[PDB]
Amino acid sequence: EVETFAFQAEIAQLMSLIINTFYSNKEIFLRELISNSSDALDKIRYESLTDPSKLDSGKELHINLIPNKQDRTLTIVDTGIGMTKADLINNAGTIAKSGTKAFMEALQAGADISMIGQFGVGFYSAYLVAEKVTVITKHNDDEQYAWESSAGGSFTVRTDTGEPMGRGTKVILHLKEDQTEYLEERRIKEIVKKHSQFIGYPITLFVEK
Amino acid sequence: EVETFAFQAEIAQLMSLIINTFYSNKEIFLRELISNSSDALDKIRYESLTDPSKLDSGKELHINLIPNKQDRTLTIVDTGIGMTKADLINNAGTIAKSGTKAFMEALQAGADISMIGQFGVGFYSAYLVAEKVTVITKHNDDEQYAWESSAGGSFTVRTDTGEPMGRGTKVILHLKEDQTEYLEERRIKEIVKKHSQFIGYPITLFVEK
Ligand SMILES: O=c1[nH]nc(-c2cc(Br)c(O)cc2O)n1-c1ccccc1F
Ligand SMILES: O=c1[nH]nc(-c2cc(Br)c(O)cc2O)n1-c1ccccc1F
């Protein structure tokens, strides 16, 4: 049922760096996840031009931001192309090994953490605000899977028999106790306006209560 | 045999806007092309994680900048994934319609031309400095093709008979007479340092002669 995998040494080092480096501009995690969501939506939209049946799993191409103060979670949902089990095992669809190597070299040369997305490892900026990240995903060519990691050098992959999503990716951020500002409506609106104003897909910020 | 194609209407409008709008900050074209090269390199790097044989066409993942004052050309070469004939043609079709339309709307609302890359049409910033653009490309699943356009609403596609490149994309900018500063070593170095200082792949600026 649950398979446990060790992260390669470079990715584990990047995750420890993201967690342990003092860096106040944490809000960039949201631009990074929305950017990944936009890329995944572009991929399914492209594939649908030659094969319209690729949208049988859902025609709407959108991004939803779901805060939950009770669970202390911020969920980013997209109806993009999704990820296969193999993509999840490939460090949640990243070029994590070569990307980390190049990003560490850039940091040593004076680059800042906000440039993480240029190295194909933008997803890991989620650990600036989350103690645990759960990735629920459904690709047309595979079953629905749940990827999960609290860092610490390992991640798990299991088949998600739960609520079917049709197609796409759900990123569930289990926020650190001191990062609850990212659950507030006015904070999320401010970040979206600042860093993701020209995203080519509708972004819906859900209300609570 | 040369095939002639019409640009998607919105791209033809964007190209005329890029060519006719007064905009002094032309140097941003380099950042956009290097960004495209970086994305294409990410794609081949990702694909090789599951299939290492995808690097049989070349293991080195890099970007080369080649100025030629004699030919008045600036060439951007990458060893990325490359483009098939279908991609090469269809990139200028219906897929680019929304991003182009959204960019032209953003411009009407006060956005500036330098934001082109946020709309997935950064390639067309090449027409800020070039009177003609030639794109030589080689994808693992197809033959080598040459795309070309001097704008005016059409582009051509033909099989390339010149140097086979193994794998990747070559963007040849036939510079406007008044844009020859982009052939000078100190100008290219200054632009790379300013806009593309921390790319995930090595950038080599070739010396002339
Ligand atoms: O493809 C695909 N599918 N899905 C996906 C995702 C992921 C993530 Br981490 C997130 O957050 C979201 C999403 O949507 N994708 C991608 C994109 C971009 C990059 C890389 C990759 F993997
Ligand atoms: O994929 C692929 N392959 N190749 C390519 C290219 C292009 C261009 Br325009 C340039 O300049 C460069 C390169 O390299 N690609 C891409 C990227 C980005 C975007 C879109 C697309 F198509």
Residue numbers in the entry:
A (entry chain A), B (entry chain B): 16 to 224
What does the paper say about this structure?
HSP90 is one of the most abundant proteins in the cytoplasm of eukaryotic cells, comprising 2–5% of cytosolic protein under non-stressed conditions. It is a ubiquitous molecular chaperone intimately involved in a variety of pathways, including cell signaling, proliferation and survival, and protein folding. The N-terminal domain of HSP90 (N-HSP90) contains the nucleotide-binding site, which has been the target site for drugs interfering with ATP binding and ATPase activity. The unbound N-HSP90 has a highly flexible lid segment comprising residues 107–14137.
However, the complexes with the loop binding compounds 1 and 6 exist in two alternate conformations after L107A mutation: loop-in and loop-out, with increased mobility as indicated by higher local B-factors. ITC experiments for compounds 1–20 reveal different effects of the L107A mutation on the thermodynamics of loop- and helix-binders. Although the binding affinity is marginally impaired for the N-HSP90-L107A-complex with compound 1, the thermodynamic profile is very similar to that of the WT, with a major contribution of enthalpy to the binding.
